[PDB]
Each structure stands twice: as structure tokens, then as C-alpha cells.
């Protein structure tokens, strides 16, 4: 792919809208719209990436490449077939990416798109939202069971916390929906403070599954949250906490 564009502005804000949801526009400018629709089950996924030519002029040598770090490539298997290199004016084309999670991962793939448009050369780079929580599935459990598991994860490096300013209104119902969207079960009457949220789930990867517990604590007067994750793996607590911290 030769010289690669630096990540488009808005790439990171956009990437964050795709963590608890599967459907959306990932990138759009005056020439091109990139849309996604995905679904996951256990350690697998299927993503549809749609490329729309918003102009009256054909794109030639239209070349989407997915670019992964050397470690990412060992943790995540992406399979696709490239699009035809010519995209007509007004057309939307697509590709299907078949995804297999081999083990826990923290980096995101980059989608790089290059093409000719008239006499110009176009180069777009954006982060692809394939994230560890996409392999996160809910675990329902009573309070007693929760606290047993919580107390088993008492090593310092198993726990990660973050304190942050709410980006959105601290809307109870929407907060519950994003926790669910993230892949967690929402467990009621575990924290005796009814303002607090508690979650459990399991990450499903080809080689190992990791049990995860979470607690979110809003302070509506201060407009701030504390999120605590405990998992058996420091990298998994880290990643899920960073991800989940950007949702509220």
C-alpha cells in the first residue's frame, strides 16, 4: 500500500461509537462513505464493509487493505476477498470480513483505502472497530456468586480502575443499555447502592476464556464515574476498562 495516510480526523471519536454497537457510518467525506454492519457469536465475527462513491466519477485502482500489528495478527484472524478495483460513480460496493478471535488482543486493525479519482490520488486510514468486547458474552449470576468470584480476583494486577468525566447525561436507562451492548450481563441487587451498576461476562477466544466482573459508580452531582474491572488477566482488565470508560 506505499505511503499510508495518517488516521483521519474523528477516527478515534468514531471508533468509540462502535464499541457497544455494530452498525454505523465509520468514515464519510465528500467523495466516500464507509459503512459497517457486524455480528459476533462466541469467538467469531462477520463484518460487512460497504464503500459508497458519492461522486459522478469512477474510482480506479480502489484498494482497501486491512493492516494489523505483528502481535495483533497472532491474536486475531481476519479473512476477506478484496473488492473489484473500479467503483462507478454513485455506486456502493462491499466486502465481507470473516473474523476469528484466537486469543485476547488490545490493538485495532487499520483500514487503509487508496484509489484514483480523476487526476488525484486518495489515501484514507481509519481504525477498524473490532474490539475485545465483541467476544464478550453475558453471565447471569446471583449476588453471592458474584462476590465469591470478585474476592477470588483480589491480586493487584487483576483490578483496573478509571475515574472520568461523563460525556453523556447520566441517564440510568441508557447506561444499562450500553453495559448490555458492551456484552456484559447487568446484575441487579448486587451493589447495595441502587445507583451503582454491576456486570459479569466471559470473553470467548479460540484458546482461552476469561471471566470478567465490572462495577460502575456514578456521582451525578459531580458528573463523574468510577469504573472497576476485575479479570484473571491484567491485559484484559486494562483493555476492557479503557474501552468501557469512553462510553459514558
Amino acid at each position: 500500500p506505499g505511503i499510508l495516510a495518517p488516521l483521519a480526523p474523528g477516527s478515534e471519536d468514531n471508533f468509540a461509537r462502535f464499541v457497544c454497537k455494530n452498525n454505523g457510518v465509520l468514515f464519510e467525506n465528500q467523495l466516500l462513505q464507509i459503512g459497517l454492519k457486524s455480528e459476533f457469536r462466541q469467538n467469531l465475527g462477520r463484518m460487512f464493509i460497504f464503500y459508497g462513491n458519492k461522486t459522478s466519477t469512477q474510482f480506479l485502482n480502489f484498494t482497501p487493505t486491512l493492516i494489523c500489528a505483528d502481535d495483533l495478527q497472532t491474536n486475531l484472524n481476519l479473512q476477506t476477498k478484496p473488492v473489484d478495483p473500479t467503483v462507478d460513480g454513485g455506486a456502493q460496493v462491499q466486502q465481507v470480513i470473516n473474523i476469528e478471535c484466537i486469543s485476547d488482543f488490545t490493538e485495532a486493525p487499520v483500514l487503509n483505502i487508496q484509489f484514483r479519482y480523476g487526476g488525484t490520488f486518495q489515501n484514507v486510514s481509519v481504525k477498524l472497530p473490532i474490539t475485545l468486547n465483541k467476544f464478550f458474552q453475558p453471565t447471569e449470576m446471583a449476588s453471592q456468586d458474584f462476590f465469591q468470584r470478585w474476592k477470588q480476583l483480589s491480586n493487584p494486577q487483576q483490578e483496573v480502575q478509571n475515574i472520568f468525566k461523563a460525556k453523556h447525561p447520566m441517564d440510568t436507562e441508557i447506561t444499562k443499555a450500553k453495559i448490555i451492548g458492551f456484552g456484559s450481563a447487568l446484575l441487579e441487587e448486587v451493589d447495595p447502592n441502587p445507583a451503582n451498576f454491576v456486570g459479569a461476562g466471559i470473553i470467548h477466544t479460540k484458546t482461552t476464556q476469561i471471566g470478567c466482573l465490572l462495577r460502575l459508580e456514578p456521582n451525578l452531582q459531580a458528573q463523574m464515574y468510577r469504573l472497576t474491572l476485575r479479570t484473571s488477566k491484567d491485559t484484559v482488565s486494562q483493555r476492557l476498562c479503557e474501552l468501557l470508560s469512553e462510553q459514558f
Binding site: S143, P192, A195, N196, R215, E217, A222, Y225
Partner: peptide
């Protein structure tokens, strides 16, 4: 059955 501490 408890969390040891609390944010608020």
C-alpha cells in the same frame, strides 16, 4: 458479600 470501598 461486599465491595470493600465506594466512589460515593
Amino acid at each position: 458479600d461486599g465491595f470493600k470501598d465506594s466512589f460515593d
